[PDB]
Amino acid sequence: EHVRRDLDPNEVWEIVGELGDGAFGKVYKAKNKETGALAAAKVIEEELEDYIVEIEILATCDHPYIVKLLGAYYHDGKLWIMIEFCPGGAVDAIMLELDRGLTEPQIQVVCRQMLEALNFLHSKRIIHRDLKAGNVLMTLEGDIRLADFGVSAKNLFIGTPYWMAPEVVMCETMKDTPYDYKADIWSLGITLIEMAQIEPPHHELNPMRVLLKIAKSDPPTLLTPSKWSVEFRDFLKIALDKNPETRPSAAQLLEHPFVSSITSNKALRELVAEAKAEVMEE
Amino acid sequence: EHVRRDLDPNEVWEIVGELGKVYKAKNKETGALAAAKVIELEDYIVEIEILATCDHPYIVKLLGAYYHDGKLWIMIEFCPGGAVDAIMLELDRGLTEPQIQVVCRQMLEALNFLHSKRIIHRDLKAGNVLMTLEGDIRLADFGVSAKNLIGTPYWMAPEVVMCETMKDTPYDYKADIWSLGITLIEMAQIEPPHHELNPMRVLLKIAKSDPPTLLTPSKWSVEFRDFLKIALDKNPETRPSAAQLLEHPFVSSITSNKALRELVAEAKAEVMEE
Ligand SMILES: COc1ccc(Nc2ncnc(-c3cccnc3Nc3cc(NC(=O)c4cccc(C(F)(F)F)c4)ccc3C)n2)cc1
Ligand SMILES: COc1ccc(Nc2ncnc(-c3cccnc3Nc3cc(NC(=O)c4cccc(C(F)(F)F)c4)ccc3C)n2)cc1
Ligand SMILES: [Ca+2]
Ligand SMILES: [Ca+2]
Ligand SMILES: [Ca+2]
Ligand SMILES: [Ca+2]
Ligand SMILES: [Ca+2]
After folding, report:
1. Which residues are named in the active-site annotation (chain B)?
2. Which segments of chain B are extended strands (E)?
């Protein structure tokens, strides 16, 4: 497997803090006794069947911009999942701590590296399905790591076809290639608005009403278009296409001028240095 | 459970024919005939709970379920008329309009029952309509039985919102109303629409084409054609429910199963030929 039962993780890892309490189980800051390496450890009390799925995904997702699995153990009735620690925290928290949105140049770095990560996931037939700023972790170098928390949404014949209703044909066709991946391109567009404006579109509406709103409204656009370049607004226009057939792929959007010339993560390294300096205030 | 482990089914049932495997079975005490599905469990208990809840005149009737000697038994009341699609093959014709009205009436009543219990069939077709010798239907499902009871919303793509909204009330039940409309055409014409296309191309066709209509509209009443027009609405929002369609003049005056009893008598007499 990708899970070790022979080894007790307490022999190798020291729990040195707490991070989150997602309903799944506790999550700790952990320090490696041999190396000093820092990790975030999710510990969960054959219900394991559902949970091994996450580890197989992570194990396949070896890429610079996706969280990096350091290990998985099952020991004394508890499942351990050890990810490399991203000291910068999530982008949404960074915006709360600085009490502002990202500059356009910080959003271009984010966008560029997300597109690269998505191009990788999709070419492996993995769909994220929960993109948002809370799922983008930052390193102190200014690189993202795409993550997923909570009820991890990542993942790889309802009748005889002559009798199938059109809406059932459509919702089955949306579940395989090349339509399924398009959902992430949309959510990416919304994440960019969230990073620009702090809140996603329709944030004022309760969760049930916002579904209606998404289905029936024109695609969202930036609140103050004069703050933003035409490249950003065109990127959104194209990504936030309600039609998944014409919505471009990650590989296509990497050639859009919003991101095609980004060759430096400087702007995002600066953001993380500033967030750290702000956190330090007392 | 709804499954007995105390009782060996061979003590009560005699296998007397073939239809895992599925047998014609005869009750040693009563003489009652049953169709028995025997299987080499989690996936399979779902079917029995559905059947156990679906006590209605026009839905297959569960007589019992046993688990014994590593085998799961599911016993349904035997419907001697067979399935409607097989009847059309044996007679080498479609149903008359009066026979389709009885079928339509009774299917609507069955669907109204299933949907009011939050059960969706999802595989309606003439091959799933069993007939009794009295001329009543029994709605069934065979094969991989299809009967049954995502992200944070601000970031969700419109197509994902739509395909999640189609999975709960009142949109999910609408799929059956469509399939009912296609079943009526299948009974009128023997084959469903687009039967010439391979299964993968037919999906594209269903999504992109206008709704299907009857090949020779002058053979059929305006009530039948209007019923289809209304039931084969591509928009599940405006597609009517089973309860609404029961008030359509195609079926609102049907008070006799005579036409369908005659069909089953004729099919039986045809089968007898040798
Ligand atoms: C309070 O301030 C901080 C500061 C830094 C951090 N840093 C950090 N670094 C790394 N991970 C975490 C983390 C925090 C809370 C919960 N989980 C975390 N990581 C984590 C992620 C996962 N899984 C995934 O991210 C995941 C699962 C399925 C698919 C995918 C993907 F599609 F993206 F590849 C990703 C599994 C186990 C763990 C411990 N947190 C957190 C809070
Ligand atoms: C070859 O000639 C004949 C002539 C008469 C018959 N009659 C007949 N009568 C009753 N059942 C069967 C039958 C034949 C082959 C397979 N299964 C049959 N019935 C059956 C149906 C079920 N389940 C359902 O129909 C079912 C399952 C889930 C949901 C639902 C529904 F949503 F419709 F309620 C229905 C389970 C077990 C069995 C043995 N067959 C069959 C073949
Ligand atoms: Ca690096
Ligand atoms: Ca908020
Ligand atoms: Ca300061
Ligand atoms: Ca055929
Ligand atoms: Ca004859």
Report:
1. 123 (proton acceptor)
2. 13-18, 22-27, 33-39, 62-68, 71-77, 129-131, 137-139
B157 and A187 Cβ atoms separated by less than 8 Å: yes
Residues of chain B with CATH 1.10.510.10: 79-274
A50, A62, A130, A234: which is the annotated catalytic residue?
Answer: A130
CATH topology of domain A1-85: Phosphorylase Kinase; domain 1 (3.30.200)
Method of determination used here:
X-ray
Check CB contact of B41 with chain A, cutoff 8 Å: no
Residues with Cβ within 6 A of ligand 2? B 19, 22, 35-37, 47, 50-51, 54, 59-60, 74, 76, 78-79, 82, 121, 130, 139-142, 145, 147
Cross-chain Cβ contact A210/B144 below 8 Å:
no
A216 to chain B: closest CA residue? B158
Q: Which of B77, B115, B142, B148 to mutate to test the pocket of ligand 2 (most atoms within 8 A of CB)?
A: B142
Contact state of B151 with A171 under an 8 Å Cβ cutoff: no
Distance CA A245, CA A170 (A): 11
What token pair was written down for A101? 């949105």
| Residue B162 with chain A: CB contacts under 8 Å | 167, 171, 215
Q: What's A86's DSSP letter?
A: -
Q: Give the integer Cα–Cα distance in Å for B251 and B259.
A: 13
CB-based contacts of A228: which residues, under 8 Å, 6+ apart? A104, A196, A222
Domain B79-274 sits in which CATH superfamily?
A: Transferase(Phosphotransferase) domain 1 (1.10.510.10)
What token pair was written down for A73?
Answer: 């153990």
Contact between A195 and B170 under an 8 Å Cβ cutoff? The reply is no
B112-115 long-range contacts, CB within 8 A, separation 24+: B112/B241, B112/B242, B112/B243, B112/B246, B113/B54, B113/B56, B113/B58, B113/B59, B114/B54, B114/B59, B114/B139, B114/B147, B114/B176, B115/B173, B115/B176, B115/B241, B115/B242
What resolution in angstroms, rounded to 1 decimal? 2.0
Domain boundaries for CATH 3.30.200.20 within chain A: 1-85
φ, ψ for residue A122, nearest 5 deg: -65, -35
Q: Report the 10 Å Cβ neighbour count for B149.
A: 11
Nearest alpha carbon, ligand 1 atom 2 = A89
Which residue out of B76, B79, B117, B270 has the highest number of ligand 2 atoms within 8 Å of its CB and is therefore the one to mutate? Answer: B76
Active-site residue A130, yes or no? yes
**If we measure between CA atoms, which residue out of A256, A207, A63 comes closest to residue A146?**
A63
